């Protein structure tokens, strides 16, 4: 009956670890959008146009 | 700028003191929530 209580304790420890389960993923920074557009880059476009002309 | 950098350092240090005490924190909270 001692092994019965030992298995009960191990099962409870597994219940705790399964319920908590801190995964390998901790979202440090949730997604945010930069208000300045990345394309098109107006200045380089105008410079390229002038140089090409 | 001195105050800002001091605040940054204090926040980092306090977070790491807290981050060190983290895995057990969630385990203990669930244990508190699981006591019959």
């Amino acid at each position: 009956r001692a092994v019965y209580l030992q298995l009960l304790n191990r099962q409870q420890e597994l219940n705790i670890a399964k319920s908590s389960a801190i995964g390998n993923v901790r979202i440090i920074d949730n997604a945010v959008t930069d208000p300045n557009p990345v394309r098109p880059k107006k200045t380089i476009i105008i410079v390229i146009g002038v140089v090409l002309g | 700028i001195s105050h800002i950098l001091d605040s940054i350092s204090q926040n980092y240090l306090a977070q790491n003191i807290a981050r060190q005490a983290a895995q057990d924190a969630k385990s203990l909270e669930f244990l508190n929530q699981q006591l019959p």
């Binding site: 440090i28 945010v32 | 700028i1 001195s2 950098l5 001091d6 350092s9 980092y12």
Partner: peptide
């Protein structure tokens, strides 16, 4: 006439240092 720009610094002891370098500049 240019506005002066001062520089402040600090020294932190780490008990690695690349993940901490990335985490310091995190938005959190």
């Amino acid at each position: 006439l240019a506005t002066p720009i001062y520089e402040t610094d600090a020294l932190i002891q780490i008990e690695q240092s690349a993940p901490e370098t990335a985490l310091l500049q995190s938005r959190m």
